[PDB]
Amino acid sequence: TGCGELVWVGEPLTLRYGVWMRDPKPTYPYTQETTWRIDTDVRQVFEYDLISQFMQGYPSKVHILPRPLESTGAVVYSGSLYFQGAESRTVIRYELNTETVKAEKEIPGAGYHGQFPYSWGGYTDIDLAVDEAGLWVIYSTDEAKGAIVLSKLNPENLELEQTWETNIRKQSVANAFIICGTLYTVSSYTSADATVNFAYDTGTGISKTLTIPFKNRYKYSSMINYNPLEKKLFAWDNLNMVTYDIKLS
Numbered sequence: 662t663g664c665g666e667l668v669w670v671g672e673p674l675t676l677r678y679g680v681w682m683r684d685p686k687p688t689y690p691y692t693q694e695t696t697w698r699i700d701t702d703v704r705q706v707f708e709y710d711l712i713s714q715f716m717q718g719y720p721s722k723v724h725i726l727p728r729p730l731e732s733t734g735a736v737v738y739s740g741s742l743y744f745q746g747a748e749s750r751t752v753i754r755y756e757l758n759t760e761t762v763k764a765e766k767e768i769p770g771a772g773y774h775g776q777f778p779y780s781w782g783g784y785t786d787i788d789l790a791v792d793e794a795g796l797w798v799i800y801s802t803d804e805a806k807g808a809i810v811l812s813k814l815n816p817e818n819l820e821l822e823q824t825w826e827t828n829i830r831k832q833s834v835a836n837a838f839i840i841c842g843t844l845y846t847v848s849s850y851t852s853a854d855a856t857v858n859f860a861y862d863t864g865t866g867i868s869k870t871l872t873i874p875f876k877n878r879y880k881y882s883s884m885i886n887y888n889p890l891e892k893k894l895f896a897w898d899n900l901n902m903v904t905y906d907i908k909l910s
């Protein structure tokens with residue numbers, strides 16, 4: 662089937678100057694092979710029309726954002742860059758082709774700037790994510806006492822269409838990502854032998870503890886972007902982009 666429960670994650674494979682992203686819902690004038698690189702005051706977004714230009718690193722367009730990014734936890738979705746404004750709980754939708762801020766949204770009650778980071782720290786309080794069902798934001802609040810909160814976002818206007826309060830402490834996991842409507846978290850032990858240790862199914866409200874091995878090289882709050890179009894995990898560890906294959910039940 663197209664979707665299912667995560668049962669296996671492959672070994673990370675290093676992909677041959679900054680974190681880059683592709684659109685899982687490519688929208689004309691862009692195509693599947695359009696790439697965007699965030700140069701890491703993170704404010705420049707470099708746009709490459711072709712994979713050749715991207716690998717033969719010559720950009721086709723440079724965007725200047727109206728404000729800098731809090732972190733690399735941004736996504737490109739349906740022609741827009743969605744990101745968190747520095748030193749804020751504000752998510753911004755920046756339409757890339759028109760260079761227009763189409764929407765801004767305060768994530769209500771969200772902690773930011775070192776309140777609810779992942780276990781390895783950094784300004785990772787708030788993460789944007791994309792899956793088969795659309796656009797998400799992962800965060801926490803004082804109301805939720807540091808438990809991971811997730812909200813499905815309307816990609817047009819950034820309204821919170823639905824919110825779930827999960828039963829896992831955000832600061833106790835190294836990372837999190839959403840596949841087929843299920844939130845998965847990555848453990849934070851000491852070895853490179855991490856695990857996908859928890860799942861929360863937003864379709865049912867059912868959560869459980871898992872033991873899926875997840876290879877991780879550095880004790881660093883990596884930028885993980887699941888790409889539902891490729892059905893692969895993409896991750897940036899401040900040094901390289903890597904891809905994890907997956908298998909769904």
Ligand code: NA
Nearest residue numbers: 788884885886
């Ligand atoms: Na992420």
